[PDB]
Structures are given as C-alpha cells and as structure tokens.
Amino acid sequence: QANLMRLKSDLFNRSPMYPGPTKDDPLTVTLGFTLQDIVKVDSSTNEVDLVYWEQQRWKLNSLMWDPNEYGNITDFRTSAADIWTPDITAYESTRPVQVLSPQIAVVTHDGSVMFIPAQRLSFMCDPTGVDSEEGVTCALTFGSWVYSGFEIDLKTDTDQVDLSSYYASSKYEILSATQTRQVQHYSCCPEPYIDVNLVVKFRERRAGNGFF
Amino acid sequence: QANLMRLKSDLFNRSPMYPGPTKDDPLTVTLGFTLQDIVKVDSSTNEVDLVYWEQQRWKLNSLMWDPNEYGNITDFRTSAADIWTPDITAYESTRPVQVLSPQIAVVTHDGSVMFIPAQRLSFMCDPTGVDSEEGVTCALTFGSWVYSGFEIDLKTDTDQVDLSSYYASSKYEILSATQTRQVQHYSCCPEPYIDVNLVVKFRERRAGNGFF
Amino acid sequence: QANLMRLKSDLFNRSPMYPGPTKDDPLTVTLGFTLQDIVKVDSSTNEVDLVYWEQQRWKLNSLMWDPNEYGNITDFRTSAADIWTPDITAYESTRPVQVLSPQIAVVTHDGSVMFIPAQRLSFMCDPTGVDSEEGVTCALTFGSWVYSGFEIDLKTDTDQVDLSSYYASSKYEILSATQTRQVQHYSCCPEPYIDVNLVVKFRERRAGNG
Amino acid sequence: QANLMRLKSDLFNRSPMYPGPTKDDPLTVTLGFTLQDIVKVDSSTNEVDLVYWEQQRWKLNSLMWDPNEYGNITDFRTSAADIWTPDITAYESTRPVQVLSPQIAVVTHDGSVMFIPAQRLSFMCDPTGVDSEEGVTCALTFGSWVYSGFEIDLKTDTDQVDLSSYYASSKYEILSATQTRQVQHYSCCPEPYIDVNLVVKFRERRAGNGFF
Amino acid sequence: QANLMRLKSDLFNRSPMYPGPTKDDPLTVTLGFTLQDIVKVDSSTNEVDLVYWEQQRWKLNSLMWDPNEYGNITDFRTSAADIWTPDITAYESTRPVQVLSPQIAVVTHDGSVMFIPAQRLSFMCDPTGVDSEEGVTCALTFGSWVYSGFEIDLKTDTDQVDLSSYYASSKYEILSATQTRQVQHYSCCPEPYIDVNLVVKFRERRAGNGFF
C-alpha cells in the first residue's frame, strides 16, 4: 500500500544506516524476558536449555517521521534486517542461539522500536538437586558484547520475568524468575559494561499432568 | 515460455514489493494442516516431533493480471522468495522449523496465492500416557508473530486436520486432530492476535501394519 | 577456455531464465536411483536413513547451441545454480535432505541436461522385522512438489534400481529395489501428480568375517 | 552519528581492502585466551569441548585517521566483516568452531584493532584420568592457517590464561592454564610457522557449588 | 601492500573466471592427504569419522603474472572464493563434509595454486575387529564428481599418506595408510573417471599416552 511503501523507501533508501551508539550519542535498550520453557538439563555437562522471548526496545532519531506526511501511519512492521539492532548477547551460552520466530520489528513514528525474537539457548548451569523440593538456581547475564555503558545502557520495565506463557506441562516448574540490571567489568577492558541478570529458580515438576 | 517470462518480469521487476498488511488494508490468511507423521516423543524433555504440510492461502491486489495480455496464462508457479509471504509461526516450537519441501507458490491471475510447505517441528508436549489405550492430547498454536488481528486475520476451511496422508506405519496412531481459529493476547501487547489451535490426540500404534 | 567462456556468457547473460514448464509446454524428467547404503534404522521413531544418487535428466530448447559457433564444444559442466532444475522431492522425508556431492550439471548442445546429486535422506519406514530372514519392505515416492502431471511428467529408463555400487559391508543387505512411475492425488488439488515409487526390501547383514 | 558516518565512509568506501600481510610488510597478532568453561569430555572419542573468548589485537596503517578531522572520534565499533581479520586457527579441532557472540571489532585511530569472539570448540584431547586428584593435561595450538612467520608473527601479553570468568560450577575445575608462543613446522611447507600453545590441566570438580 | 592490491585487482577484476577444464584443455590436479585423527567409529551404522587435511594443487594460465611488474611479488594468499577450485569429492561419505580451517589458497606467479583445507568426514566403514591386534581396514575414494579423466587428471606425488601430524593420543592407532590412483566407471557414463583411493588400516590404541 502506497503510503507505507513511500515511508519505507524514504526511511531506508536515502541515507547511511545508523552506525550504532557512541559516547556522544549513547543509547538505552530496555530488556524483558518471557520465559516459555525449560526444555532440558544435562548433568554430565552442566548445561540447561531455555526457550524464551527476548523483548527489546530502543529509540532512534533517524527512524522518526511525521505521520501527517504518510497518510497518518503511526507505526509499521519491518524485517529486523532493515534496521540497526543492538548486539545484546547472552554471556554464558554454550551453543549458538537458535532462533524460533520471524525476526521482524515494529517501528513507531517517534523512532522507537520493539523487537521480540523467540530463542532457544543452552547455557552454563549446574542442575544438581533439580529433583528436590528446593530445586536449583541458575543465572544468565545478557548485555552488549562490544559496547560499554558509555555507549549502551540497559534497563528493565519490571524485575519480574513474564511467566504468563510458561508451558504448564514442562518437565520443570519455575519457583521464581527475576531480571535485574547490573554492572560488570571484563578483563579486556577498563570500562563498565551493563547487563541484565536473569536468575531462575526451578525444579522437576512433580504435580499436574502425568502425575497422580 | 515467452508469455510467462513477460508476466514474471512485469510483476517482479518494476514496483516495490508489497510492504505487508496494515490496519487500513488487513489481510485474511486461510490455513489448513495435513498431518503426515508423529515421528518422535521425548519424555525426558516433553518435546514431540511432527511432520505436516501447512497450506496457506491469501490474496494480493498487487499480484493480479489480465490473462488476455499474457497469452491466457491464469496461474503460475514461482519461488516463494519472489513474493510476500505471511509470518505464520508455531508458538510453542522448541527447535527451528525444518523445511522438507521446495518453497514455491502458485499465484493465480486474481492475485490469490497458494503455498504449502512441508515442515518438521519439535514442540512442547508431555507424552506421558501415550502407550495407553486413552493416549495423550497435545496442542500447538499457529499465528502471525508480529501482526495483530487488526492486520492479519486467520481462518480455516474446515476444523478437521487432513489425515489422508498420515503415515500408516507411524509409531503413533491419531485418535483425533482438529484445527480451530481462536483469539489470544500476549503480555507484550494489548491488541488481540489471532491463532489456529492444532489439537492432536494420539497413542502408540498397537494395530495395523507390522502387527500381523 | 575461451570458447567455453563465450558459450556460458551467451547462454546465461542474455535472456531471462526458463520459468519452468507450463500446460502449454510440459516437460518430462527422467529419474533413476543408485542406492549406495542404508546407514541406519530407528525403531523408536520408524525412520530409516538412505544414501543414494539420484540421476535426473531433462531437455530445454533454451539450452541449445550450435557447436560450430563455439569451437565445436558439444557439452559442458556448470553449477546447477546457473540453470533451471526440477523440484523433484521425496514425499515421505522426516529431515531436510543432506547433499553429499557438488551440485553441477552437464549440459549438452541439444539442450539436454544430466544432473546426479548424492543425498542422505531420513524417511518414514517401520523397520520391524529387519533382523529376520524375510526382512522388511519400505517405500518412498519422489515427484515434483508443485507441478501436476499437466506440467511435469516423470519416467524411468528401467524399473531396476542400480545396486552395483551398494556398500558391501553395510549393516543392511538389499534384497531388491524397484523404481516405478505412478500417479497420485493429494487433498489440496484435484489434478494427477506423477511420482516414482522407490520400493526397497532389505534385512540385517549379520554374516561377515572380513 | 554524523562524524562517525563520515569516518566509516572514508575508511571503507574509497580504497581496496588491505590484502593481508606479506614478507615485505609483516604483521604481529597478539593473542590472549579467556577460558570460560570446559563443557564436556568424551572418553570414547578423545574429544574435549571448551568455551573461550579469543582476544586478538593487531594494527594496520590503513585504519588510521586524525581524530581532529572527525569530531574528535578516537575509536569505533564495526562489524568484523568490514575489516581484514587474521586467519587464526585451532590446529587440532574436530568440529567446526561455533561462534557464540557477535563479531564486531573496535578500531582505534592509530589503526589498532581489538576483536574478541566467544567460541565453542571440540578438540583432540585424551581425558583419561580426569576423575582423579592429579587430573589430566591437554594442549591445543593456535596459529595462522596459511601464513608463515615471514608474514604473521604471534605474541601473547601474558603466558597466563585469563580464568577470571571461568564458570565456577563447571563439571571441571582448572588446575593450570598457560598460553605460550612456539615455532612449528608442517609437511606441506619448509617455512617457520608460529603458534600459541594453550595448555590446560584440569580435573572433575568435586568441591564448591553443588557440593555439601 | 600497494603492489599486491594492484596484482589482485588485475587478476580478479577484468576477465571472466576460468570455466573449468574441457577435453581440449584438460587440467591436472595433484592430491595428497595428511591424516590427523580417526575420531570415532560407529558399529551400529558402520560409519567412521576422520579428520584430515586434503592438499590440492593445480595450475592455471589465467593466474600467471610477471613478478617484475608487481614489486617482485612471487606468490600471495587469497580467499578460495576468489578462484576456481576443483570438485574433488569423497565418494563414500555419509554426512556432508565439515570444514575445520579457513579456505584460503596460495597462488604463485607461474599460475600454480596450493589449497589445503582441513575436513572432518563420516564415511562408510565397518569397524568390527578394530579392538584386535590385526585391526581393520577401510577405504575411501576421492575424485572429481563431474569431470572424467579426459578433463581432470588426478595425480599424487606419493602413495604414502602423511602421518607426521597424526594425533598421538587418538583412540585409534594407524597401522598403515596409502593413497592410490585408480580408474573408475559409473553406470551413468562411458568415460573413465580418475580417483584416489585412501586406504587406512587401524586398530584401538593400546599404548602411548598413559597406558601404564
């Protein structure tokens, strides 16, 4: 349809893509997790596999437009390949991430973006004691791989992981799940790097479907 | 041949591709499933693997042509990469979908499209009790990942899953399989999203071929 | 090299690619299978894994040239991606096909093409009884995914599957294997679709002292 | 922003890419390892799986700029695909490396580059005796695949592998881990080749988190 | 530096790529193997996994240059994607080959090319008896997939497989390894095809690393 095609052409076909954030022009990315399933634990390797949706939000001036000039369009869907996306990376993964959903973002006229890819990830986690009442706790940090806090900052809208889509008949049940902004330093570099620490306490489900 | 070459050049060379549906120009996608095989169950991870053909139909004004101007061509096969396709997604997969067939669509002169890829998918399903007379029931929802009901609506032509190509010597026999349109909300967003709920009841095959 | 470079340039840079067959201009694809190895059976999922070569042949007028104009070149090898290839698909696979060879076709001056990829495929097959004298029978159909018999017809040169390269120390011995043209229908469409039915009878190979 | 866009355009859009080092113009690559986890040992195949971050540094004249001409920009992040990178290779791997992080480098105005990809690698290692107090030692060499020491020299900044991020609840604990420059020869060619020898001594962890 | 950029531009930016050999202009490809490890045997499927480096050499007139015109450059490294490469294929593989090294070749001013990728391959091999003194023998043939002996003449410089980099603590020790040229015919075609037969006799390693 005509106005949207016009908008996309104007946004994407007449300027260099945004070169990412800088010290002079930093960016804050909002992160939120929807934990869908703990699929698998491996006690011989201390890896656990999660399926989650990773909600990402940020805003770029270069993605702004006046809806009046585009038939009142206030937002649109577009392939995530058409726009800059933050290098938010799980820091304790053991396998490359597996993408389970289309990668398509929603862009709004004020230059804000929402992007929520579904992912399966194997990560470092010792599941010893998962078949007990107390269960086990594991944690996983997410943050920019390459940008320090001087270029990319992070925040969560809530410290409570969204569990409203958690698979009720998973082999594992969630005792608690939080997502908390933290600061980290790595050996390579003097500067502070921001992460969101996903902390999940869980155990083998012993009630519900399959259990009598 | 010559006329088809002209038609494909005229449709695919001279205009921007359809930017997807919008609130002002929504799209209805028709879905239907042909369930070919339940291949595997995993009771240590509560994952089940299906092979199915997913029939998708939709119509675009931008894909219309006058057959009179193209040697009376009324339809053609074309690579799915050549056209917009809907982002219909299984919401409870645990691995990336595996495509088992070419991805080629049929486009008709009225702009309607038929596209039927074969896929293998692992999804969240507790198979406990599958080896019993009563079997087990699992459900899997399919819908747009990024578009609400305001942009993409779904429908089925029948609520019965097509079982006429179901593998007769599968480990698992199908007791029932339905596909039903429904409405869902996710935490990220306040708008209604539409899905098709695929509900399959099954058990270990204990009769037929290989059972004397 | 020079003559061949000119031929490939002239064939592939001057006109749109063949858009595939139509009712007005159908195409017949010849298929033949060489079974190399039954690698694995899985009795917990009823899947069997085969390694085979699939010989495909067809002919397109748009691939014709006069050898006199190209230093008497009568055929050439080229990447299969440079030409149209038919969408011949195993209908009962359970995993994406794994290609084990380069995908390069031979094109002949009369427009005929030969293309023989090596593939490993997992497919739907109940292996119960494979460890018995009678063994087991499994079948796999191959045909176009999207074209009916009005656009793509199939044929074989023989109904005898080529077993001359079958791995002799396989876990499984082949009793027989046939490849036969058939007509099939599927729910989506009312038109006849053509396939080649590959039927393999096999059993465990237990005897062998190297 | 504007100045960075100018800089990237100038560096990347007007000259052929650096064609790699030569005898006349050799390059020294500094290497360092951050060992994050020994994930798995396979005693039936003598393969061991590591997760590590591989820190690579080098300097090119062609990547220099005057910060004064570019709004006082002194460094920037850019996709590793935008620049030449060294073909540093694990010589005893048994599976293709799996990349676990974005591949983005930092380029500084003096032409220096820092690139630190996270990787999972299976390599040749006999883990017999890992379950004892003395543990086992394995070695893995890293070097250019195709350049001799006439074109690529290697250096470490320290002979101590960085263990500050080692996963505390790994199945395996590290007894020692060193990284040492060496000079090796291969049958194909007569020239001196340079490697970095990663030597890890480790055993099954039987103390700490998960142990009471 | 400057001279190499000139050379690569001159070689790669003006003429069509070599279209492969023909009967009128056949090509000799020299093959040699460096056997690094027998990683795994599978007695359930009769597959064995090897790691080897496959040394390939051939010469093209179109890759020649006068060193005098290019600052005395007599050879250079270049991505294998920049040049034509022969379709040398393992004939009894059971999985797609996995590449373990960069794919970069060395081109010399006389037009000759050296290219040595490291690979892991699963192939057809019955390992029954590998745990004995006499061990077991398996053979794997390599040759062009599509070119007969009239287009590609395969040669070896030696029938001795290079064992100088064989992993000393492999599960399997090598008793002998030879590489032998032979003529094959395939049912499809009347022409002779040339292959190299890699024949490896091996057994379970019962002495070496530890083996106290």
Ligand SMILES: NCCc1c[nH]c2ccc(O)cc12
């Ligand atoms: N993410 C930890 C390593 C790291 C910090 N800053 C970086 C910049 C570039 C890079 O490739 C890697 C890094």
Ligand SMILES: NCCc1c[nH]c2ccc(O)cc12
């Ligand atoms: N499908 C669930 C998440 C979701 C809803 N709307 C979306 C829009 C864009 C996106 O990447 C993701 C979403």
Ligand SMILES: NCCc1c[nH]c2ccc(O)cc12
């Ligand atoms: N490599 C055995 C089959 C074979 C012989 N010649 C060929 C030519 C093309 C092709 O795809 C395959 C072949």
Ligand SMILES: NCCc1c[nH]c2ccc(O)cc12
């Ligand atoms: N091959 C079975 C499904 C089928 C028949 N005709 C088709 C046309 C297009 C398509 O995507 C799929 C089909």
Ligand SMILES: NCCc1c[nH]c2ccc(O)cc12
């Ligand atoms: N060091 C691995 C073998 C080797 C040495 N020099 C090389 C040059 C090119 C190549 O592909 C491979 C090599």
